[PDB]
Design a binder for this molecule. Structure first.
Ligand SMILES: CCCCCCCCCCCCCCCCCC(=O)OC[C@H](COP(=O)([O-])OC[C@H](O)COP(=O)([O-])OC[C@H](COC(=O)CCCCCCCCCCCCCCCCC)OC(=O)CCCCCCCCCCCCCCCCC)OC(=O)CCCCCCCCCCCCCCCCC
Lengths: 171, 63
């Protein structure tokens, strides 16, 4: 067949969000609140193109907007966030429910210094709409032309010409 | 019976039987070509209904 095209290693260099999973899980509700638009443009491009090579730049925007999400935490509320993700980080299942007062301190300092409202129960699971400028893929599966169907039956049904025509049976 | 009656009755019998014999040979040839090519209404062995395919957005994108 053909050669599969791959992007170069410079096309894959972006500054990584090099924080732990409890750090990501601690700020995840405010992350889904504040980093909505580039994340949803990326996941729309990712379910529509069905190809990650066509989804690099939007992904870079994700990694552009996540870092600016954490810098904006690090400039303002580094200590209550640190006290919060440490308590998230203790738990083996990483329970939100074991960590409600540290969550309250982090949410208080974030609403005071950044004005961010934490999403409620049922908001980040909504199907939202995304206004992009990229065109709709007319053939995301790269499917070739389908075979033409067999001709259907038409014409009025006539009797059998002289019956069964089986050796001597005249009907 | 008159010789006219037997004669013309014989011609009608011969018309019916010649038409039936030509139609039997055409039936053989039609079945041969429809088994060879599969483009007629016979020998249409079933395939999978494509209405069974779930075209919803799935859990992972790459599919
Ligand atoms: C206005 C609206 C109302 C109008 C009303 C008008 C009518 C009023 C009267 C009402 C009654 C109508 C009767 C039926 C129509 C006429 C049927 C007919 O004569 O067919 C001729 C038919 C062929 O002749 P034809 O010149 O081509 O057609 C003239 C008509 O146009 C015949 O028409 P066709 O050209 O369209 O024929 C079609 C085709 C013509 O046939 C063909 O093209 C050839 C294929 C025939 C079958 C061959 C099979 C051979 C191997 C098996 C042999 C079995 C053993 C033999 C019998 C042993 C005992 C059972 O038929 C078939 O293929 C079907 C099979 C044969 C059925 C015949 C009727 C049987 C009814 C009574 C059953 C009693 C036993 C009869 C004999 C059974 C064996 C057949 O003759 C035969 O096949 C030979 C058998 C004899 C005919 C049956 C006669 C029926 C009356 C019998 C009374 C006596 C009974 C005694 C006691 C019982 C026996 C022990």
């Amino acid at each position: 067949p053909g050669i599969v095209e791959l992007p170069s290693l410079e096309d894959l260099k972006v500054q990584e969000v090099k924080v732990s999973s409890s750090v990501l899980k601690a700020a995840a509700h405010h992350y889904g609140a504040q980093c909505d638009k580039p994340n949803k443009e990326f996941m729309l491009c990712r379910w529509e193109e069905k190809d990650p090579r066509r989804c690099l730049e939007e992904g870079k925007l994700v990694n552009q907007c996540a870092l600016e999400f954490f810098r904006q935490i690090k400039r303002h509320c580094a200590e209550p966030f640190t006290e919060y993700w440490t308590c998230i980080d203790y738990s083996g299942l990483q329970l939100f429910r074991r960590c409600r007062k540290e969550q309250a301190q982090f949410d208080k300092c974030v609403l005071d210094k950044l004005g961010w409202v934490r999403p409620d129960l049922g908001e980040l699971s909504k199907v939202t709409k995304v206004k992009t400028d990229r065109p709709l893929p007319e053939n995301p599966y790269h499917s070739r032309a389908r075979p033409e169907p067999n001709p259907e039956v038409e014409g009025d049904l006539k009797p059998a010409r002289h019956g069964s025509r089986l050796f001597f049976w005249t009907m | 019976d008159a010789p006219e009656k037997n004669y013309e009755r014989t011609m009608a019998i011969l018309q019916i039987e010649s038409e039936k014999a030509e139609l039997r040979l055409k039936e053989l040839e039609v079945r041969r070509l429809m088994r060879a090519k599969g483009d007629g209404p016979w020998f249409q062995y079933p395939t999978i209904d494509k209405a069974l395919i779930d075209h919803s957005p799935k859990a992972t994108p790459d599919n």
